[PDB]
Amino acid sequence: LYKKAGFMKGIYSALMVPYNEDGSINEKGLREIIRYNIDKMKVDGLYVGGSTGENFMISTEEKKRVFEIAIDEAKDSVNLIAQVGSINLNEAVELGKYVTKLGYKCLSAVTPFYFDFSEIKDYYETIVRETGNYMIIYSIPFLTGVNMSLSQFGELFENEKIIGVKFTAGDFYLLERVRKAFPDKLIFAGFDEMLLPATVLGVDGAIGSTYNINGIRAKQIFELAKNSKIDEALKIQHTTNDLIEGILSNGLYQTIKEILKLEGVDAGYCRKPMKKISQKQIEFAKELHKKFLK
Amino acid sequence: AGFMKGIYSALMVPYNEDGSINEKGLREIIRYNIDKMKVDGLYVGGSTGENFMISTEEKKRVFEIAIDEAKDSVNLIAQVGSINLNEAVELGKYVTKLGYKCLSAVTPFYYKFDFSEIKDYYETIVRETGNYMIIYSIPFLTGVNMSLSQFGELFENEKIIGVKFTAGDFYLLERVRKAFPDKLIFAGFDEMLLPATVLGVDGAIGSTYNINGIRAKQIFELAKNSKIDEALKIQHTTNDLIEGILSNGLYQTIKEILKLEGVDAGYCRKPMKKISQKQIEFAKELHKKFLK
């Protein structure tokens, strides 16, 4: 339908945040990662604040500082989505209000793992109505759960400001059903290693962490599959998944940071008392870079 | 084995009230698949044929009729797997003698066999029959989840020529396709035919092709030939039909639609529930909207 926010289509990097040794934000490194994504990966958008290991119990003051820097550095060059969930509802509202005042024009949220569908719906609709901003839902509204039902999607998509969904589990029957039932909503693939089969089911783009270093190939897959070049897209998805297979066996986030540094980006190391990367994983990351990205 | 590519119906079998085979109706279902659905092949003795609900002798009679009626007009695969390896070899030898040129076998289930035992099972059927083998992988029913390196171990056997892939794991599907470009991969999930096709599967084996095989071949061919937009529209229409089939009872609704198409599709094996008035009328509406 013509009412879709079609300008939002494309490849979004789940923005990696670098940290200093003491745990604070490496603001200079963060600006380098933003610039690398915009200028070298050529991403269509940035997805800021997704919950990972190092992201989760960081202070909201540091969450806010990441949001300020990201929109200051990106300006209006790419689309932005700010994830403001994974915290209590009143906390998520004050964060949604803050990023809205900063100028973010689209929110996303996943709920905390405390549950009933009425509580999920109220969580989303509260953020929307208290911030006045647009909202991308998650297909799985918390971690240890499963994808929502088709009629639950309808309850949420009844809200005009709930404009799309990040699809995080690869149920491709449900993905087809959601695409058919809501042609006016955006669907973003959350699974980088399944971008090609998602693209032919009509997803509007993809949100992923590997696009920080593999955004060029990802954009090629998306574009070729939508323009009658499926054989070429499949070969690039094959190459991409050789890289992803190695990234996954070597530790996803620590390997992305190592390859960023091999590309000259001051990405540091994984934060917190999160497990230190090993000498063997350092060497494997170097081999992955030489073979796939150098 | 490139000549085996394409769309295979998992052949349904009509049973009488007492569970015995309705031979007249079985020939009618075969004729409908070959002549009207225009399938490239028949997958005989699979889950869809209620294979695991019937006796060894009843399985043999289904295999006899199917190849007698189909002759060499379409490809034929005979599913001979079982928890009983001695039965699997017996059935595999029997259908090989009948003239079937390719076997399939579900992973042995119920007991928690480890992978070395699963490998012995496949290699034993191949060794004892001399026939080709397609791995039947269906974790939703068996609980057996096979790794990429485990597929590699099985695929070192030159007569294990492919896999019927029913796990909805499209990362694993892409990894198997890349690792084994010389093997056949058949999609087992009719409602995900389009995404599987663009990952390079060689065909599909499905229950809904007994009645929706025309659209299935369209999706497959269009997606391989730079018509993705058209293939998605037909997958969308197909999945409206499949969504109704699933809500109405899969086996009962396919058999009911076959009857609306003039094919005597008989009953399901007990304890499969008999179809209800509500389900009969729903099937009539699916037929009128999607297939008449």
Numbering used by the authors:
A (entry chain B): -6 to 107, 110 to 289
B (entry chain A): -2 to 289
Question: What did the published study say regarding this structure?
Answer:
N-Acetyl-d-neuraminic acid lyase (NanA; EC 4.1.3.3) is also known as sialic acid aldolase. NanA belongs to the class I aldolase family, which is characterized by a triosephosphate isomerase (TIM)-barrel fold and by aldol condensation that proceeds through the formation of a Schiff base intermediate between a conserved lysine residue and the substrate pyruvate. Here, we report 2.32 and 1.76 Å resolution structures of N-acetylneuraminate lyase from F. nucleatum in two forms: ligand-free and with ligand bound as a pyruvate Schiff base. Sequence alignment showed that FnNanA contains conserved catalytic sites (Lys161 and Tyr133) and the conserved specific substrate (Neu5Ac) binding motif GXXGE.
The crystals of ligand-bound FnNanA with a pyruvate Schiff base intermediate belonged to space group P21212 and diffracted to 1.76 Å resolution. The two monomers that were identified appear to form a tetramer with a similar monomer arrangement to those in sialic acid aldolases from other species. The structure has 0.17% Ramachandran outliers. One residue, Lys267 of chain B, is present in the disallowed region; the electron density for this residue is not well defined. All residues were modelled into electron density, except for Tyr108 and Lys109 of chain B in ligand-bound FnNanA with a pyruvate Schiff base and the residues at the N-termini of all monomers. The observed electron-density map for ligand-bound FnNanA with a pyruvate Schiff base in chain A clearly showed that the N∊ atom of Lys161 is conjugated as a Schiff base to the C2 atom of pyruvate. The carboxylate group of the pyruvate makes hydrogen bonds to the backbone N atom of Ser44 and to the hydroxyl group of Thr45. In addition, the Tyr133 side chain makes a hydrogen bond to the hydroxyl group of Ser44 and a conserved water molecule. Tyr133 lies almost parallel to the Schiff base intermediate and is engaged in hydrogen bonding for the Schiff base reaction. The overall architecture of the ligand-bound FnNanA with a pyruvate Schiff base is similar to that of ligand-free FnNanA.
